[PDB]
Amino acid sequence: PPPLSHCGRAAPCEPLRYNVCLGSVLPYGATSTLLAGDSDSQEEAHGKLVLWSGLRNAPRCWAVIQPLLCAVYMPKCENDRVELPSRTLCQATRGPCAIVERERGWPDFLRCTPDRFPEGCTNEVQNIKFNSSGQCEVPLVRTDNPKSWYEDVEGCGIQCQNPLFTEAEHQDMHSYIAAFGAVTGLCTLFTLATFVADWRNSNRYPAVILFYVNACFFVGSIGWLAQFMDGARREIVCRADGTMRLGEPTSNETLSCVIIFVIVYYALMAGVVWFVVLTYAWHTSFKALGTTYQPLSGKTSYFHLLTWSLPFVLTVAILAVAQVDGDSVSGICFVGYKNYRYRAGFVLAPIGLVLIVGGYFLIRGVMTLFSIKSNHAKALIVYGSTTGNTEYTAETIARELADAGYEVDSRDAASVEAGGLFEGFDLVLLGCSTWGDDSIELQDDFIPLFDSLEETGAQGRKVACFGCGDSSWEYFCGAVDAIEEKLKNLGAEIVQDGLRIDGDPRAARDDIVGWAHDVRGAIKINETMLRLGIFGFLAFGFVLITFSCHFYDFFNQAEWERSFRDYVLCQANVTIGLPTKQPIPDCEIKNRPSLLVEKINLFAMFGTGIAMSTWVWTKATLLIWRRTWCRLTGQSDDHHHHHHH
Amino acid sequence: PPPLSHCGRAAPCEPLRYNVCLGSVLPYGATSTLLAGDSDSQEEAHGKLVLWSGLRNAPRCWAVIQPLLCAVYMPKCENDRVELPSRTLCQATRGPCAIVERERGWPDFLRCTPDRFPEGCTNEVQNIKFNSSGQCEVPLVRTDNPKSWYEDVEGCGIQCQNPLFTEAEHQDMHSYIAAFGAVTGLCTLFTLATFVADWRNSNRYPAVILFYVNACFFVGSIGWLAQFMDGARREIVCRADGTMRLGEPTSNETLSCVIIFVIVYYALMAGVVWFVVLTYAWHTSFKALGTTYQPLSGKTSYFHLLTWSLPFVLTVAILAVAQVDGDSVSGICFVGYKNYRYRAGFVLAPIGLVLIVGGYFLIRGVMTLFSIKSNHAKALIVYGSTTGNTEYTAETIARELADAGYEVDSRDAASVEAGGLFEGFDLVLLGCSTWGDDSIELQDDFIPLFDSLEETGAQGRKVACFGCGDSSWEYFCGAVDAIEEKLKNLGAEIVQDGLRIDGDPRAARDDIVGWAHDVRGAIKINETMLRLGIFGFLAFGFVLITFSCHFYDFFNQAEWERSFRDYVLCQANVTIGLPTKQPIPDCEIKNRPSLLVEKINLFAMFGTGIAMSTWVWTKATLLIWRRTWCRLTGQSDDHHH
Numbered sequence A: 001p002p003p004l005s006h007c008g009r010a011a012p013c014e015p016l017r018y019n020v021c022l023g024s025v026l027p028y029g030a031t032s033t034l035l036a037g038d039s040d041s042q043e044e045a046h047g048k049l050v051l052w053s054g055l056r057n058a059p060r061c062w063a064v065i066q067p068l069l070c071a072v073y074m075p076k077c078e079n080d081r082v083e084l085p086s087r088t089l090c091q092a093t094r095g096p097c098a099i100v101e102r103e104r105g106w107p108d109f110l111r112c113t114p115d116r117f118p119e120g121c122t123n124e125v126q127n128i129k130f131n132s133s134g135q136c137e138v139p140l141v142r143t144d145n146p147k148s149w150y151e152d153v154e155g156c157g158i159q160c161q162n163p164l165f166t167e168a169e170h171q172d173m174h175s176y177i178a179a180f181g182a183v184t185g186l187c188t189l190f191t192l193a194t195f196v197a198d199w200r201n202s203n204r205y206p207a208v209i210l211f212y213v214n215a216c217f218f219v220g221s222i223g224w225l226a227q228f229m230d231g232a233r234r235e236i237v238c239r240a241d242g243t244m245r246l247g248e249p250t251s252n253e254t255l256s257c258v259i260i261f262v263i264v265y266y267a268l269m270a271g272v273v274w275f276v277v278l279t280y281a282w283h284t285s286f287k288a289l290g291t292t293y294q295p296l297s298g299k300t301s302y303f304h305l306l307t308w309s310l311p312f313v314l315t316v317a318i319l320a321v322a323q324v325d326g327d328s329v330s331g332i333c334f335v336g337y338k339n340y341r342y343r344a345g346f347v348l349a350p351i352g353l354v355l356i357v358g359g360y361f362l363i364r365g366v367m368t369l370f371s372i373k374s375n376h377a378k379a380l381i382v383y384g385s386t387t388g389n390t391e392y393t394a395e396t397i398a399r400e401l402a403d404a405g406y407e408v409d410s411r412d413a414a415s416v417e418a419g420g421l422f423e424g425f426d427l428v429l430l431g432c433s434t435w436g437d438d439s440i441e442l443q444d445d446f447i448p449l450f451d452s453l454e455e456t457g458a459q460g461r462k463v464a465c466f467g468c469g470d471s472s473w474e475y476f477c478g479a480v481d482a483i484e485e486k487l488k489n490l491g492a493e494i495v496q497d498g499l500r501i502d503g504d505p506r507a508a509r510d511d512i513v514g515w516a517h518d519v520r521g522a523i524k525i526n527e528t529m530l531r532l533g534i535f536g537f538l539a540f541g542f543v544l545i546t547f548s549c550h551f552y553d554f555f556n557q558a559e560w561e562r563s564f565r566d567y568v569l570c571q572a573n574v575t576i577g578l579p580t581k582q583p584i585p586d587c588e589i590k591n592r593p594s595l596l597v598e599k600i601n602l603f604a605m606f607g608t609g610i611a612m613s614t615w616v617w618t619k620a621t622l623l624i625w626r627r628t629w630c631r632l633t634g635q636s637d638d639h640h641h642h643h644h645h
Numbered sequence B: 001p002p003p004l005s006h007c008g009r010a011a012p013c014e015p016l017r018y019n020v021c022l023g024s025v026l027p028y029g030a031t032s033t034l035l036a037g038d039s040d041s042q043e044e045a046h047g048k049l050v051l052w053s054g055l056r057n058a059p060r061c062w063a064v065i066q067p068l069l070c071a072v073y074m075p076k077c078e079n080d081r082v083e084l085p086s087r088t089l090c091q092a093t094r095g096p097c098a099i100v101e102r103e104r105g106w107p108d109f110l111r112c113t114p115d116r117f118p119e120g121c122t123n124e125v126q127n128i129k130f131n132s133s134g135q136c137e138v139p140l141v142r143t144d145n146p147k148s149w150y151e152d153v154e155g156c157g158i159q160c161q162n163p164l165f166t167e168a169e170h171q172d173m174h175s176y177i178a179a180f181g182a183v184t185g186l187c188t189l190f191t192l193a194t195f196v197a198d199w200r201n202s203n204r205y206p207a208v209i210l211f212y213v214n215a216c217f218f219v220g221s222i223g224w225l226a227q228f229m230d231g232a233r234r235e236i237v238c239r240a241d242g243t244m245r246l247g248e249p250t251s252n253e254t255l256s257c258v259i260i261f262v263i264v265y266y267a268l269m270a271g272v273v274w275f276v277v278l279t280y281a282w283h284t285s286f287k288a289l290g291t292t293y294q295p296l297s298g299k300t301s302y303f304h305l306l307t308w309s310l311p312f313v314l315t316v317a318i319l320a321v322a323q324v325d326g327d328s329v330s331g332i333c334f335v336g337y338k339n340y341r342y343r344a345g346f347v348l349a350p351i352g353l354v355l356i357v358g359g360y361f362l363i364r365g366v367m368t369l370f371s372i373k374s375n376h377a378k379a380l381i382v383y384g385s386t387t388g389n390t391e392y393t394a395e396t397i398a399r400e401l402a403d404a405g406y407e408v409d410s411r412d413a414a415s416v417e418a419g420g421l422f423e424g425f426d427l428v429l430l431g432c433s434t435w436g437d438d439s440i441e442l443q444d445d446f447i448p449l450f451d452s453l454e455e456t457g458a459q460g461r462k463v464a465c466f467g468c469g470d471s472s473w474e475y476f477c478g479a480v481d482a483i484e485e486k487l488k489n490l491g492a493e494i495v496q497d498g499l500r501i502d503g504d505p506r507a508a509r510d511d512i513v514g515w516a517h518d519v520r521g522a523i524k525i526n527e528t529m530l531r532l533g534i535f536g537f538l539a540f541g542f543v544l545i546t547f548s549c550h551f552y553d554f555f556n557q558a559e560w561e562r563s564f565r566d567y568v569l570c571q572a573n574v575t576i577g578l579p580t581k582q583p584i585p586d587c588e589i590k591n592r593p594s595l596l597v598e599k600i601n602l603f604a605m606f607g608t609g610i611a612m613s614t615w616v617w618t619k620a621t622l623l624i625w626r627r628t629w630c631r632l633t634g635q636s637d638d639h640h641h
Ligand SMILES: CN(C(=O)c1ccc([N+](=O)[O-])cc1C(F)(F)F)C1CCN(c2nnc(-c3ccnn3C)c3ccccc23)CC1
Pocket: A162, A164, A173, A327, A329, A330, A334, A336, A337, A338, A557, A559, A560, A561, A562, A564, A592, A593, A594, A598, A599, A601, A602, A605
């Protein structure tokens, strides 16, 4: 067909000084510099192409901009007429070459004007094959998937390995996760094993909480350790093409990322909710005996309801807003690595709420603990002393109890009536020296009390004895033996082994102080519940450190994301306008996340699991597996244990 | 020949109003009352002869005084001359008629004066035969033998049958001696037979004392039972003539009395000396229990020296002073029946001496009973307690064992190492409470000990278990069951069934005290030493009763001997010359020996032998006569090989 008048412009033809345009040979021999507005000569047109060739980086732009640049700077001129490039050739660059309008801006002669670029014209460059493809820079990787391209740079995608941290820092962090993960995995596994080895007896509701607390940290450990199997880490953190996994759940990608996300986050949130249960349980167990509250042993349908539903609602909500992001250095998929606000919302806020609710019950339980001890602070000290040594011991014991918060009433046996003497005291300390040359004779003033000791109200009373004697005599502190014996026959609860002073009690003052310290120590305020309280405050400590680390990351990640963008886009090269002074990359990370804070975070996190596994580190546990061995050997034959077997 | 002038006196002859003198006819018809100084007429002379005829009793005197009294009161007067009695007729009465000079005294005309009774004259009464011999009253008997004559009554002797006791009382006493004698004879014979039946093992010197103690009461029984042989009693208690045997040995009399005396008295004194040996042996043996030291070892020789020589010296001394007296009611010859002082000297005094010496060693032995012993008992109490109930039980058991003399070491199972833990204890008491909801689980602190219980040294150890539990739980004190099952499988000796407390031990304190008491009991002690001590005090009791009875007889026989003399001399009558002055005979016993005291004496004597024969009344004796029948039949514990 003959050429159209509007698909050509009148221009004086000049012979081509260059027989090649951006690596491809030209079929014609005459050109024009009329289409190029910035160029007047072929030498200048060639010079501009060397500046435009800076777009090799971002290849899906480079592939479409090569034909357009050859159709404008080096076009076909034949019989004093230059061919115009079609509108379709110009419009094909607008999209993938957005970076041009974003950085420099399309010049007057390269904007798709119907005057400069007419509709339905033969391009001539359509016949010419441009085999040049381009390449992506070191922090980016070529990806075909459009859902993996990084911002403006179409054709390239952000690599899987986090570019803010070196390979040395990756190896260092993975070694740290392997160490804590394995210890936490093993310790919790031992605790879950001993509980199921005594499952029918260990289901008692005050301690069964520590079983589920360990169960969460056990499942959590599996999520963090999954990355160490051969090749798993890249199946969890890298996409099929090779770019890092962002905004999961995402289409046409394996579940490996969301599976590990659920295991880590759900076990994290189920664990912190079981913490609030532990703090609540210790708090309410006191008022079960003290005032009116009744045992909570049977709230299986209420604690399991809230501990397993709240993490479920949160995990489903994260998958819905699809903010599950993968990370090579942490080796797991978690909520809010790309966008810090989601990590703050679904992690920092729930951990903050469990600290104020859980912290409230620790305060309440302690206030209950201290009010009960003040209601059990009356103590009677009755002493029988001739030369004043037991009197001195009684008075020494009295100040130690008083310094500890008791209301001490010290009385001489010579001035007391036996009838209902011990009525109204939480503790009764009876002191008497030993006399009698051939035998055991009590100090004279204590005989009337000792003979009518049945009328004192010793039955069920918490008592302890003391007394002064001399090893130089036969039957050392025989009176202490006799009083302990009559009190024990009347039904009194002997708190500790009688304090028997040899010689002068002043030269044994700290022994008296030491005994009086231990005698209050033996005054139990639920031994079974006390341990539940240490573990409550212990867990709170580690949860508070975890919250602090997430707060640091929340308060600074806005700057690190900006620093991430500025570094990758600068490393992408693609500097079209002019060439830099040296080929040097001239690119830095102004600020990045702190790996220390993350190690402190994992220490507090995994550390809770290790600390809670020590709940079953008692003598009772040794007997649990003893039964398991003894009656695994006793069950090696037929049937099992019996009444006389 | 013509009659001599000095064999006759001038007197007026008067015809005889009485033709008979003391039962004999007179050849002459004229008499005189000149020779009789107390008589003036024939009626008065006849009257005096009736008073002199009171001497029919004491016939030795009556036979010789009849001719003299007829020659003085009714003499021959012929041609105004009365015949004088010869000196020989008068001198013949002086001796056998001593009673006359002892009671009234010979009158002036009956003393042998050469003036009143000249030498060599025809008596005339020499031709006259006096057939009258006289008599001996009921407690006396006529005896030819001079030695048997009793006191002043020559011609009579005290009968064999004791006149103070009736025939009914003799039969009653002989029946009592026959009963005890036979039982004591049989019982001791069985005991002597059993020691001989197994003489090698029973010849141990703490026990063989009881063999010789029985040997004495056996020989003694033979002496008391010998009287029951047909007519043996009268050969032992009566002399050949028929009078009771007094102050023997006596000439021309059988040994039957001294033979029975030796058998009874020697066996009595050998027995009471063997008692002092028994009291000494227990005293020294019980003292030497804390060591191997054997105290009696060389004393064996010295015991036989003392026990067999002292009775011999005494028996010989009694035969020397010859105070062996026979008695019909006791039926045996013994020392001091006639004279109480010899019975007191040779019986009461030695029995008194054996009581103070023998009593001393019984006291010394009870002093050893309450003295500190060299050997004490060691006991270990290991307890496993969570709420302190088994700890309380352990301490309650401890204080009870300690009150009994044990050295109790009470330890908590939580603070002990199982390795050689029971080493050095006589008794080990393990205590443990039961725990576990579905099964039997021991108190937590006892598990380490229970699992390494093989290393404690329980093999052959005497053990007993205890523990607290609650019936409200399925397996009541299952830990007590498990511990005594493992101890029994290791070879420990379970002393008693485990003390299993239901609920609070404080409300069952005396049950714990009671169990602890019974645990000590099942520990075997020296039953032979114990038993020797009981037989020592048993024998002392009976010896003390025997002494009491001999003391009664000693303190009163002086009166009974006086009563014996007064009654016998009364029954027989003498009356030398008295019109008796209207009297009442009233001849009776004022006081006699008590037969009750004698029965109490024999009961305590024979009773000692019966009590000491019980020494061989044990289960071992049944086995001794078991082996004896088999060994003599030839066969062993089945058939001989
Ligand atoms: C997110 N991020 C980035 O580098 C990052 C990635 C992509 C973009 N972007 O724009 O595409 C931006 C960024 C930036 F701006 F740098 F944040 C860091 C990754 C590493 N790191 C960790 N964070 N949490 C945990 C941890 C503790 C307890 N539980 N968990 C889950 C953790 C555990 C171990 C080791 C490290 C951890 C800190 C944040």
